[PDB]
Design an enzyme around this catalytic site. Structure first.
Site, PDB file in Angstrom:
ATOM      1  N   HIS A  45       0.799  -1.219   0.000  1.00  0.00           N
ATOM      2  CA  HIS A  45       0.000   0.000   0.000  1.00  0.00           C
ATOM      3  C   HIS A  45       0.837   1.276   0.000  1.00  0.00           C
ATOM      4  CE1 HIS A  45       0.823  -0.966   4.129  1.00  0.00           C
ATOM      5  NE2 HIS A  45       0.471   0.258   4.485  1.00  0.00           N
ATOM      6  N   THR A  48       1.851   4.127  -4.545  1.00  0.00           N
ATOM      7  CA  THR A  48       2.849   4.065  -5.599  1.00  0.00           C
ATOM      8  C   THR A  48       4.121   3.338  -5.283  1.00  0.00           C
ATOM      9  OG1 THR A  48       3.502   6.265  -4.764  1.00  0.00           O
ATOM     10  CG2 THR A  48       2.006   6.198  -6.696  1.00  0.00           C
ATOM     11  N   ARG A  49       4.717   2.820  -6.350  1.00  0.00           N
ATOM     12  CA  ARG A  49       5.976   2.110  -6.296  1.00  0.00           C
ATOM     13  C   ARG A  49       6.852   2.492  -7.487  1.00  0.00           C
ATOM     14  NH1 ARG A  49       4.141   1.231  -2.170  1.00  0.00           N
ATOM     15  NH2 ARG A  49       4.164  -0.596  -0.784  1.00  0.00           N
ATOM     16  N   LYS A 265       5.803  12.493  -2.344  1.00  0.00           N
ATOM     17  CA  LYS A 265       5.860  11.407  -1.381  1.00  0.00           C
ATOM     18  C   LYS A 265       7.317  11.023  -1.164  1.00  0.00           C
ATOM     19  CE  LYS A 265       5.065   6.532  -1.293  1.00  0.00           C
ATOM     20  NZ  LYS A 265       4.408   5.476  -2.117  1.00  0.00           N
ATOM     21  N   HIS A 269      14.836   4.718   2.994  1.00  0.00           N
ATOM     22  CA  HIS A 269      15.003   3.300   2.694  1.00  0.00           C
ATOM     23  C   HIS A 269      15.921   2.475   3.574  1.00  0.00           C
ATOM     24  CE1 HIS A 269      14.552   0.055  -0.247  1.00  0.00           C
ATOM     25  NE2 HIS A 269      15.839   0.036  -0.551  1.00  0.00           N
ATOM     26  N   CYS A 315       4.333   0.696   6.291  1.00  0.00           N
ATOM     27  CA  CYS A 315       4.367  -0.526   5.532  1.00  0.00           C
ATOM     28  C   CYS A 315       5.562  -1.363   5.983  1.00  0.00           C
ATOM     29  CB  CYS A 315       4.336  -0.031   4.076  1.00  0.00           C
ATOM     30  SG  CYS A 315       4.807  -1.064   2.691  1.00  0.00           S
ATOM     31  N   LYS A 348       8.261  -3.819  -8.150  1.00  0.00           N
ATOM     32  CA  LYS A 348       8.451  -3.589  -9.585  1.00  0.00           C
ATOM     33  C   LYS A 348       8.554  -4.898 -10.359  1.00  0.00           C
ATOM     34  CE  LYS A 348      12.296  -1.475  -8.593  1.00  0.00           C
ATOM     35  NZ  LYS A 348      12.525  -2.086  -7.248  1.00  0.00           N
TER      36      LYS A 348
HETATM   37  C1  LIG Z   1       6.588  -1.188   2.331  1.00  0.00           C
HETATM   38  C2  LIG Z   1       7.310  -0.560   1.260  1.00  0.00           C
HETATM   39  C3  LIG Z   1       7.720  -1.421   0.286  1.00  0.00           C
HETATM   40  C4  LIG Z   1       8.263  -0.928  -0.909  1.00  0.00           C
HETATM   41  C5  LIG Z   1       8.339   0.472  -1.108  1.00  0.00           C
HETATM   42  C6  LIG Z   1       7.945   1.377  -0.059  1.00  0.00           C
HETATM   43  C7  LIG Z   1       7.448   0.875   1.132  1.00  0.00           C
HETATM   44  C8  LIG Z   1       7.048   1.831   2.223  1.00  0.00           C
HETATM   45  N1  LIG Z   1       8.728   1.035  -2.298  1.00  0.00           N
HETATM   46  C9  LIG Z   1       9.027   0.122  -3.295  1.00  0.00           C
HETATM   47  C10 LIG Z   1       9.273   0.680  -4.555  1.00  0.00           C
HETATM   48  O1  LIG Z   1       9.219   1.891  -4.827  1.00  0.00           O
HETATM   49  N2  LIG Z   1       9.564  -0.254  -5.582  1.00  0.00           N
HETATM   50  C11 LIG Z   1       9.626  -1.636  -5.424  1.00  0.00           C
HETATM   51  O2  LIG Z   1       9.889  -2.362  -6.362  1.00  0.00           O
HETATM   52  N3  LIG Z   1       9.349  -2.121  -4.174  1.00  0.00           N
HETATM   53  C12 LIG Z   1       9.061  -1.275  -3.188  1.00  0.00           C
HETATM   54  N4  LIG Z   1       8.682  -1.798  -1.956  1.00  0.00           N
HETATM   55  C13 LIG Z   1       8.820  -3.299  -1.733  1.00  0.00           C
HETATM   56  C14 LIG Z   1       7.612  -4.056  -2.293  1.00  0.00           C
HETATM   57  O3  LIG Z   1       6.397  -3.306  -1.964  1.00  0.00           O
HETATM   58  C15 LIG Z   1       7.645  -5.409  -1.564  1.00  0.00           C
HETATM   59  O4  LIG Z   1       8.860  -6.061  -1.862  1.00  0.00           O
HETATM   60  C16 LIG Z   1       6.383  -6.304  -2.115  1.00  0.00           C
HETATM   61  O5  LIG Z   1       5.199  -5.677  -1.954  1.00  0.00           O
HETATM   62  C17 LIG Z   1       6.520  -7.615  -1.438  1.00  0.00           C
HETATM   63  O6  LIG Z   1       5.369  -8.426  -1.939  1.00  0.00           O
HETATM   64  P1  LIG Z   1       4.828  -9.720  -1.190  1.00  0.00           P
HETATM   65  O7  LIG Z   1       3.849 -10.318  -2.071  1.00  0.00           O
HETATM   66  O8  LIG Z   1       5.967 -10.458  -0.640  1.00  0.00           O
HETATM   67  O9  LIG Z   1       4.093  -9.083   0.155  1.00  0.00           O
HETATM   68  P2  LIG Z   1       2.536  -8.561   0.265  1.00  0.00           P
HETATM   69  O10 LIG Z   1       2.212  -7.772  -0.914  1.00  0.00           O
HETATM   70  O11 LIG Z   1       2.496  -7.976   1.649  1.00  0.00           O
HETATM   71  O12 LIG Z   1       1.695  -9.858   0.223  1.00  0.00           O
HETATM   72  C18 LIG Z   1       1.715 -10.876   1.269  1.00  0.00           C
HETATM   73  C19 LIG Z   1       0.326 -11.293   1.497  1.00  0.00           C
HETATM   74  O13 LIG Z   1       0.282 -12.480   2.299  1.00  0.00           O
HETATM   75  C20 LIG Z   1      -0.771 -12.406   3.193  1.00  0.00           C
HETATM   76  N5  LIG Z   1      -0.682 -13.296   4.300  1.00  0.00           N
HETATM   77  C21 LIG Z   1       0.210 -13.182   5.316  1.00  0.00           C
HETATM   78  N6  LIG Z   1       0.148 -14.160   6.165  1.00  0.00           N
HETATM   79  C22 LIG Z   1      -0.845 -14.964   5.686  1.00  0.00           C
HETATM   80  C23 LIG Z   1      -1.411 -16.169   6.132  1.00  0.00           C
HETATM   81  N7  LIG Z   1      -0.988 -16.798   7.256  1.00  0.00           N
HETATM   82  N8  LIG Z   1      -2.417 -16.732   5.428  1.00  0.00           N
HETATM   83  C24 LIG Z   1      -2.849 -16.119   4.306  1.00  0.00           C
HETATM   84  N9  LIG Z   1      -2.347 -14.944   3.798  1.00  0.00           N
HETATM   85  C25 LIG Z   1      -1.352 -14.433   4.549  1.00  0.00           C
HETATM   86  C26 LIG Z   1      -1.016 -10.898   3.458  1.00  0.00           C
HETATM   87  O14 LIG Z   1      -2.299 -10.567   4.000  1.00  0.00           O
HETATM   88  C27 LIG Z   1      -0.606 -10.253   2.150  1.00  0.00           C
HETATM   89  O15 LIG Z   1      -1.753  -9.920   1.369  1.00  0.00           O
HETATM   90  O1  LIG Z   2      12.773   0.980  -6.762  1.00  0.00           O
HETATM   91  C1  LIG Z   2      12.756   0.557  -5.614  1.00  0.00           C
HETATM   92  O2  LIG Z   2      13.027  -0.603  -5.265  1.00  0.00           O
HETATM   93  C2  LIG Z   2      12.382   1.490  -4.608  1.00  0.00           C
HETATM   94  C3  LIG Z   2      12.043   2.771  -4.714  1.00  0.00           C
HETATM   95  C4  LIG Z   2      11.774   3.178  -3.429  1.00  0.00           C
HETATM   96  C5  LIG Z   2      11.957   2.144  -2.597  1.00  0.00           C
HETATM   97  O3  LIG Z   2      12.340   1.055  -3.295  1.00  0.00           O
END
Ligand SMILES: *Cc1cc2c(cc1C)nc1c(=O)[nH]c(=O)nc-1n2C[C@H](O)[C@H](O)[C@H](O)COP(=O)(O)OP(=O)(O)OC[C@H]1O[C@@H](n2cnc3c(N)ncnc32)[C@H](O)[C@@H]1O
Ligand SMILES: O=C(O)c1ccco1
Ligand SMILES: O=C(O)c1ccco1
Ligand SMILES: [Cl-]
Length: 385
Positions: A45, A48-49, A265, A269, A315, A348
């Site tokens: 959430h 944006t990414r 925003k 990191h 996050c 990404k």
């Molecule tokens: C947090 C963050 C991350 C981030 C970023 C800025 C912030 C503040 N900026 C990024 C950016 O500009 N560019 C980029 O490429 N990455 C950036 N990131 C990292 C990226 O958001 C994370 O690496 C990515 O979202 C990781 O994805 P993943 O699929 O691993 O994680 P998720 O989206 O949280 O999904 C996990 C899901 O699993 C569910 N869950 C958890 N436990 C359970 C159980 N027990 N049973 C069923 N489901 C479960 C969660 O609810 C979730 O939906």
């Molecule tokens: O591009 C990325 O992986 C990124 C931008 C901001 C945080 O992570």
């Protein structure tokens, strides 16, 4: 009484993309999530990414970034939700002092990516609103940009469901039972079975992979971002202010231009609080560093984007010891695929990773080179219970 071909546990960034790839092929798929994606309890959430192609974390990620970019353009054509805006991405830092900037430059050269090199006052002149010291250099990638991450997950979910994928929401998987010819998950809402399992639980991988007999160091981190009232004549996407990821003496910061007046925003990191995903405080501002670490950067480098805090978000990153991802088959179960440890930079690649996970689940192999994401690599320190 319904078996599935594949079950995806965790229908977030990686899992929902995998679900879309599986459903598109007629594979009977069940996606189970603890909440209802997209949501604000995971890692996707904050709206944006950044997507970059010239990759500072390592030139070996480039092919996957380019394939993922192609897939995001395909997604844009398939849905009514907005997926990508080509803001360009600016990377800068002190000349000769940033390994991140240097590797971004090397990656661009090695892969013949289109970039602009500039330095000092050239940066301040090209993008009014940026004020860097004269000893800073930069590499700008015009064709990369920004993804609307919640929209991406929402679109993949809608497309997957239309093709027959089932999504069981608000259901936490509590245990796993793996056999040689089948997989089973246990939840308070019932147990489900399939031929193959994809595990993509985000920050919760750090707590539940032990239920699959895996011991892998994974550390979840609390990572905040803030949106600030800014001079729209300088920081708006409409005047081509870029997305950015930069290195300064005290760390790496990243940010986004103001879209429709939402404000610039920013996120810090390289620092975050070590937390547990079930007890993390998701309220922005409960620690004074949440807002102060952001304004320390803004007042020095983007002074006109340091107005009132309009919105904050909390996050999580899930880091491995080497900060490279884990994408591989379970070492003891070829019918189980693991996607974990995205270390703050995986969104990404989620479109491309969805493709890889689908291939691993259906065939036990992938056409992608994923050796650097091996679950058996030395630097990861993986083992069994
Ligand atoms: C947090 C963050 C991350 C981030 C970023 C800025 C912030 C503040 N900026 C990024 C950016 O500009 N560019 C980029 O490429 N990455 C950036 N990131 C990292 C990226 O958001 C994370 O690496 C990515 O979202 C990781 O994805 P993943 O699929 O691993 O994680 P998720 O989206 O949280 O999904 C996990 C899901 O699993 C569910 N869950 C958890 N436990 C359970 C159980 N027990 N049973 C069923 N489901 C479960 C969660 O609810 C979730 O939906
Ligand atoms: O591009 C990325 O992986 C990124 C931008 C901001 C945080 O992570
Ligand atoms: O502190 C970290 O970043 C960590 C611990 C285990 C894996 O990553
Ligand atoms: Cl992450």
């Amino acid at each position: 009484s319904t078996h599935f071909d594949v079950i995806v546990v965790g229908a977030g960034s990686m899992g929902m993309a995998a679900g879309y790839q599986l459903a598109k092929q007629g594979v009977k798929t069940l996606l189970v999530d603890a909440f209802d994606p997209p949501h604000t309890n995971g890692s996707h959430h904050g709206d944006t990414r950044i997507i970059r192609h010239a990759y500072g974390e390592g030139r070996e990620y480039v092919p996957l970034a380019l394939r993922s970019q192609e897939l995001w353009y395909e997604l844009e054509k398939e849905t009514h939700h907005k997926i990508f805006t080509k803001t360009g991405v600016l990377v800068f830092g002190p000349k000769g002092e940033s390994a991140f900037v240097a590797e971004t430059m090397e990656a661009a050269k090695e892969h013949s990516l289109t970039v602009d090199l500039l330095e000092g006052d050239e940066i301040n002149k090209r993008w009014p609103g940026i004020t860097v010291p004269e000893n800073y250099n930069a590499i700008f990638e015009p064709n990369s940009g920004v993804l609307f991450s919640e929209n991406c997950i929402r679109a993949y979910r809608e497309l997957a469901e239309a093709r027959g994928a089932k999504v069981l929401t608000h259901t936490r998987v509590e245990d796993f039972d793996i056999s040689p010819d089948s997989v089973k998950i246990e939840t308070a809402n019932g147990s489900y079975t399939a031929d193959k399992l994809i595990v993509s639980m985000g920050a919760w991988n750090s707590k539940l992979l032990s239920k699959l007999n895996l011991d892998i160091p994974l550390q979840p981190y609390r990572q905040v971002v803030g949106f600030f009232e800014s001079d729209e004549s300088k920081y708006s996407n409409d005047i081509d202010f870029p997305g950015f990821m930069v290195e300064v003496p005290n760390g790496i910061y990243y940010g986004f231009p103001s879209f429709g007046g939402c404000g610039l925003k920013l996120g810090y990191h390289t620092f975050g609080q070590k937390i547990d995903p079930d007890t993390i405080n998701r309220e922005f501002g409960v620690y004074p560093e949440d807002e102060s670490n952001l304004r320390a950067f803004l007042e020095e480098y983007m002074p006109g984007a340091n107005g009132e805090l309009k919105r904050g978000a909390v996050c999580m990153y899930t880091k491995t010891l080497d900060e490279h991802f884990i994408i591989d088959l379970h070492p003891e179960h070829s019918n189980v695929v693991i996607a974990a440890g995205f270390s703050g930079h995986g969104f990404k690649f989620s479109s491309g990773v969805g493709e890889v996970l689908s291939q691993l689940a259906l065939t036990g192999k992938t056409e992608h080179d994923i050796s650097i994401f091996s679950i058996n690599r030395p630097a990861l320190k993986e083992s069994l219970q």
